[PDB]
Amino acid sequence: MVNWAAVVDDFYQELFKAHPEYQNKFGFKGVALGSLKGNAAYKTQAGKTVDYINAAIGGSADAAGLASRHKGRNVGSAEFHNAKACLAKACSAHGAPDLGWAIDDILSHL
Numbered sequence: 001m002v003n004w005a006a007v008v009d010d011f012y013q014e015l016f017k018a019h020p021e022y023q024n025k026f027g028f029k030g031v032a033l034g035s036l037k038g039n040a041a042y043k044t045q046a047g048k049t050v051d052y053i054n055a056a057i058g059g060s061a062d063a064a065g066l067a068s069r070h071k072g073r074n075v076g077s078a079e080f081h082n083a084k085a086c087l088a089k090a091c092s093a094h095g096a097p098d099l100g101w102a103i104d105d106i107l108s109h110l
């Protein structure tokens with residue numbers, strides 16, 4: 001099966017490399033990027049991200065609910081546009097299908 005866990009790991013590496021300040025909103029704030037895989041808060045977040053991807057593909061994802069939760073953290077369309085680019089890179093590195101359509105679904109509620 002597609003290794004979404006690896007894709008998500010690359011996604012977070014790209015995301016926080018381009019926008020380090022985004023990492024301050026998470027429970028793994030201040031943690032060195034190359035050590036995130038050993039951080040408990042990160043493992044949980046990454047797992048939830050993998051879950052969301054599988055839910056989007058599976059057809060059970062609640063894009064409206066995810067958008068509202070992100071608004072609840074002062075995360076908006078701009079951040080999601082930035083994320084879209086990082087995820088596109090991360091998918092490509094693993095021969096995985098692109099996920100822009102799923103981010104578009106979220107953006108449609110931001």
Ligand code: HEM
Binds near residue numbers: 023026045069084103
């Ligand atoms: C491809 C784009 C993204 C996806 C698929 C995604 C997915 C998720 C998921 C599944 C959760 C958990 C929600 C829950 O538990 O109900 C979450 C939480 C969160 N997301 Fe994202 N996200 C994305 C982009 C971003 C960006 C760009 C930011 C920028 C700051 C961000 C900030 C957060 C924060 C602060 C949380 C809560 C963390 C915590 O509870 O400690 N997200 N995200």
